[PDB]
Design a protein around this ligand. Structure first.
Ligand code: NA
Length: 291
């Protein structure tokens, strides 16, 4: 097809609350809290245990990753992903809805949406407005235990939605793909340090453009409209008809670029999973710049 038929990437709090009330959480619909916070800040699993959407599971990104990698938040193996999500009651037929507790409204949820897609699962969405707006609207929360029945999931890597270090290095020369970095402006420019690391300089990969991820959300933490999102890409000279790689610190907020592009009808954005954390450690310093 010239354009694939895209599955809904956003669901509303009203839709999810109606679904939960109707008893739809089960093999057909699973809900995940994917929150993660930098050390010494919020407690993701404790917050989940105190308050979650009824029937939701905690998706532990610290566990569901390649823990043998020297780099941050790297995809697990197909088997690792499949075993973990099957333990949360997710099969290949399940609609997965992801949220997180970010204070603006989204941080890790798009990363898990992308993880499902990069493992061949299209039936996945994020909660528009996050747990922030679930709470603000007064929708039900519980501390009751979720105990989903186990399921079988088959994970198949879609390599078109992933980029490696080697492919990003080839792209410095080929310029086949636009490289878009979702880090905050100061970190992208090199005027603010990279946090939560030893000796990791800030700056950015030569040729990359900066689209700080929080610009995709409204002040209330909802996704901007497709018309607004398209305008943002156009004003950054990112052409949605041309190939696009998204990158950030560790491959997490880059998935907000992929989500924004998907809502504009461009599902083919690939994530540089290694991102700046891998780049700075592996690449020659001639490949990146800092103010
Ligand atoms: Na990563």
């Amino acid at each position: 097809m010239v354009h694939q038929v895209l599955y809904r990437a956003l669901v509303s709090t009203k839709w999810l609350a109606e679904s939960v009330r109707a008893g739809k959480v089960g093999p057909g619909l699973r809900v995940l809290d994917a929150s993660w916070y930098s050390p010494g800040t919020r407690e993701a699993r404790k917050e989940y245990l105190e308050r979650h959407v009824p029937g939701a599971s905690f998706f532990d990104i610290e566990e569901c990753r390649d823990k043998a990698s020297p780099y941050e938040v790297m995809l697990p193996s197909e088997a690792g992903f499949a075993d973990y999500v099957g333990s949360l009651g997710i099969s290949n037929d399940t609609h997965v809805v992801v949220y997180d507790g970010d204070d603006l409204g989204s941080f890790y949820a798009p990363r898990v949406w992308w993880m499902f897609r990069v493992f061949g699962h299209r039936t996945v969405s994020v909660l528009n407005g996050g747990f922030r707006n679930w709470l603000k609207e007064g929708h039900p929360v519980t501390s009751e235990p979720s105990r989903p029945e186990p399921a079988i999931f088959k994970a198949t890597l879609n390599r078109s939605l992933l980029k490696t270090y080697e492919q990003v290095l080839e792209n410095l020369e080929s310029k086949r793909f636009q490289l878009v970095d979702s880090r905050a402006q100061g970190r992208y420019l090199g005027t603010q340090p990279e946090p939560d690391a030893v000796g990791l300089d800030s700056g950015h990969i030569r040729g990359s453009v900066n689209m700080p991820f929080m610009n995709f959300l409204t002040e209330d933490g909802f996704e901007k409209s497709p018309e607004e999102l398209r305008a943002m890409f156009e004003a950054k000279k990112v052409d949605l008809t041309k190939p696009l790689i998204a990158t950030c610190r560790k491959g997490v907020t880059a998935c907000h670029i992929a989500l924004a592009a998907y809502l504009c009808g461009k599902p083919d954005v690939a994530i540089y999973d290694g991102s700046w954390f891998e780049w700075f450690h592996r690449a020659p310093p001639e490949t990146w710049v800092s103010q």
